[PDB]
């Protein structure tokens, strides 16, 4: 029957996906699709194949953003979900959680991740467990669950650093670690990890990783209120993203948002509006409603003083389960209004900061 | 804003 | 030599101390002191004896407050601290941490507790480990380290509930659990645990435990802004403390502080000053500088508007490593000034609340 | 103020 022959090739396929080896991953994708052709109707093997195709696509889109094959692969994967068991059930929940995170579906992604976490003792490969620990630490950071994100990211970075050639994941883990130290107001303890990632990103010549390193470095200077140095980090990050075929990635909007916020705080009103312009039009073109709403908040704050639109956006982001952006944006409004000596409305946004922090603290 | 976890 | 004969009796002595059995503890204290008389100069056995005398005194003072034998027992214990090993080294660090906590020496108590924590695998008795988990969860609550306090209090309450006659510790664990839920803004999830403790405290007729249950219940009503019901809980807690020989305990000052704060917020200015009066004079009589400073903050806020004395007191409490009281008191001033439409200075105290919460979040 | 942990 040679059902294990397809089984071993799909596992090898997964190994090359984690190594970010597109040539090897494409070779084995073709090998599996030729073996699948002359094979009995094994529903678990076909579901295993469909899951790895979904994982293979997640790697490609990460390296080449969409100018949707993901949706068709998701439909076939969600056609047989009963009678699942063993490591295949782990792969199903874990991969679905990865997809939900890409769709800003945080509550669904957490739920999928926690189901995959229950079957972690079925994962003998330490590298595969490092993939899980990194991905669960990533979403915990975006939830500003710092202690849980640190608990998982240390387990991931140690397993990755034990092996070699997982350098891409090593850069990404350096992002998570430093960004956790940043959330704890330790920018001095975060710049080492980001400069570490920037160095190794320049070695493998990974343009978006270089830009993400510049973006995370600019977030440190922003925390230190080194707005000039922060804007320069943001500028070069937008430059490397655009100069290497990443100007259509949703993640460049994060850099545009901070650069708009930074130049506004530098009292460079004129330059700031043209930055908020480019960011909000690009958010509309990429159909990213969440990033567009964040640019609306910046425009309503520094340009319009439309506090009702500010409140509705903060309420929108809370229903989006993005309480950290609720805190960051309400903190932006509180400082600006307190600087403008409008202490009446500045109190109300300081209260919203306190509200978001308590909600973040509630956790589960 | 959240940093890039890539 | 019968050195184990004294060793087994001191362990039995410890068992009766944890059970809060004063008659049994006094009997075995006398038995050990008679065996110690006819024994060779065993420095470890004498240090073991001196530690249990210190622990025996901690139990007595908890049941009968001082109208100082503790200081003499502490001097003899801190006369031989080198060449320590095994479970005796655990007892030394743990008991010193218990004493430092009673002296408001939180950083020293944490350090002692963490040294005792390193040797926890030497503790075979589950009940003895429950004593540690409760005591370490207690100080973590007072540090508003909610996740760590919850991590330890669950291990303690389960071991205690497994055995019987440790009901006093069961009430105290119900305090810690509910107070953690209160810090997470879950008063509905805290009243069950406090009513649980109040019931079992009334069974054993433990007056101060009944009052502490009323105090913790009043803190829930205060969180719900049920100031009338909160003041009634506080009133009865002061009544049971005074009517049963606890009017000279430092812990009655906590109840006086909240009742003063509550009646002030009820706009009952007149009744509130006479409450702050009784509390600040009693703090001076008990030589509790920390509780006296808290009554100074309430008087400077609602009566004097002395914001410079407020800032210095908050700075004093931060050096005292009491960031939770920094947050609670700065929150009291922010609401009062925002209600008085003094939004300029109300911002500054909301900022101090944000500062204290970030410091609490930093942890280690 | 901190609650009574007794």
Numbering used by the authors:
A (entry chain A), C (entry chain A): 6 to 72, 78 to 374
B (entry chain B), D (entry chain B): 1 to 6
What did the study's authors say about this model?
Proteins of the RRNPPA family are the most frequent pheromone receptors in Bacillota and use small secreted oligopeptides as pheromones. While most members of the RRNPPA family act as transcriptional factors through DNA binding, Rap receptors are specialized members that exhibit the capability to develop their function by interaction with specific protein targets. Binding of the pheromone produced from the propeptide, which is named Phr in this RRNPPA subfamily, induces Rap receptor inhibition. Our results reveal that distinct maturation processes generate multiple mature pheromones, which bind to receptors with varying affinities but produce identical structural and biological responses.
Interestingly, the internal pheromone RRGHTA showed the highest stabilization with a dTm of 75°C while the canonical C-terminal hexapeptide pheromone showed a much lower (63°C) dTM. Rap3T shows 4 times lower affinity (EC50 20,75 nM) for the putative Phr3T C-terminal canonical pheromone (SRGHTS) and more than 10 times lower affinity (EC50 69,75 nM) for the possible maturation variant of this peptide with one less amino acid. Remarkably, these structures exhibited nearly identical conformations as confirmed by the low differences in the superimposition of their Cα atoms for either individual monomers or the complete dimers (RMSD 0.36–0.50), dispelling the notion of peptides eliciting divergent conformational shifts. Comparison of complexes with RRGHTA and SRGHTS peptides showed that the sidechain of Arg in position 1 for RRGHTA mediates a network of salt-bridges with D264 and D335 plus hydrophobic interactions with M304 meanwhile the Ser in this position for SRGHTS only makes a hydrogen bound with Y225. These differences in interactions for position 1 may explain the lower stabilization seen in thermal shift assays and the higher EC50 value from thermophoresis assays for SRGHTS. In contrast, at the C-terminal end, the presence of a Ser in the SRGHTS peptide does not excessively broaden the interactions of Ala in the RRGHTA peptide.
